[PDB]
Write a protein that binds this ligand. Structure first.
Ligand SMILES: C=NC(=O)c1cc2ccc(-c3cc(Nc4ccnc(N)n4)ccc3O)cc2s1
Length: 279
């Protein structure tokens, strides 16, 4: 029950990790990086922030959430002086496995087992009154390249300690589900179609998909936030709850995600701004 509180180290991060000026210079510009622990040799991830209230918020929330088996663990946080400018250097577990959809790009039950995982990340956050507000393809990473890797939620730049915010996380869940089951997002102006909730479940991709499953997506994508299901109701849905009573039925996802790649950069982009719009 009792876990340690957050301790910001003030020694030069380069005492503890191999990091170079080149791999530091790319950091101040948002990118997260490959670093190595000197004592153990293990691989970790570095993310660099300029110290400021926003950065302190992120670190704080992320530390609080690290506990979850389904959220990237903060391992250390440093407060250093970089080129005469205060910085927060965040050290994280390394996620070799790449982004959720990049994997698939290589089964209904597999789709469900994934959503249950993203589901736990959200339940944990919501239990401790945090809303993530940027749950999307590139914040879902697999620990390693093994078939059995754990999928983890990352990036708390927009997380917010509290509901409208929470329902934003549920909407993402709907969108990630839709794509998982077919390989393309819903709402196929864009802004208008989202406002209007204008999506469908096209054959062929959706012909042998349970009405129960569609109803589920339908609840998550509700245009009126107070109408969406909550994480608890999501997590108690049969499709999610018993992820091993769900039919091994094949999905067009992997093929579609392969042919229709090149659009992938555009859907990552649309979803990022949809999210930006609901914040
Ligand atoms: C495939 N070549 C490699 O050898 C790897 C390079 C990287 C680079 C980064 C990460 C990694 C990335 C993130 N990403 C972000 C981005 C933004 N915010 C947050 N909190 N995390 C979070 C945790 C991570 O381990 C894993 C690897 S594996």
């Amino acid at each position: 029950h009792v876990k340690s509180g957050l301790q910001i180290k003030k020694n030069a991060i380069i005492d503890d990790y191999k990091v170079t000026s080149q791999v530091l210079g790319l950091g101040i510009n948002g990118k997260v990086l490959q670093i190595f622990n000197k004592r153990t040799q293990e691989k970790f991830a570095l993310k660099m922030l300029q110290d400021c209230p926003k950065a302190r918020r992120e670190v704080e929330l992320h530390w609080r959430a690290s506990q979850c088996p389904h959220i990237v663990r903060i391992v250390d946080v440093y407060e250093n002086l970089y080129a005469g400018r205060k910085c927060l250097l965040i050290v994280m577990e390394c996620l070799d496995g790449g982004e959720l959809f990049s994997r698939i790009q290589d089964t209904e039950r597999e789709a469900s087992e994934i959503m249950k995982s993203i589901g736990e990340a959200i339940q944990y956050l919501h239990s401790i009154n945090i809303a993530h507000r940027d749950v999307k393809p590139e914040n879902l990473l697999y620990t390693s390249k093994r078939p059995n890797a754990i999928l983890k939620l990352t990036d708390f730049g927009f997380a917010k300690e509290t509901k409208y915010d929470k329902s934003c996380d549920m909407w993402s869940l709907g969108v990630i589900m839709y794509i998982l089951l077919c390989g393309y997002p819903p709402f196929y102006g864009m802004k208008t179609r989202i406002r209007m909730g204008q999506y469908e479940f096209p054959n062929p991709e959706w012909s042998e998909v349970s009405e129960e499953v569609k109803m589920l997506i339908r609840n998550l994508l509700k245009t009126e936030p107070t109408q969406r299901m909550t994480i608890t109701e999501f997590m108690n849905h049969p499709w999610i709850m018993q992820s091993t009573k769900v039919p091994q039925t094949p999905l067009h996802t992997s093929r579609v995600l392969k042919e229709d790649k090149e659009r992938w950069e555009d859907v990552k982009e649309e979803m990022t701004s949809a999210l930006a719009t609901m914040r």
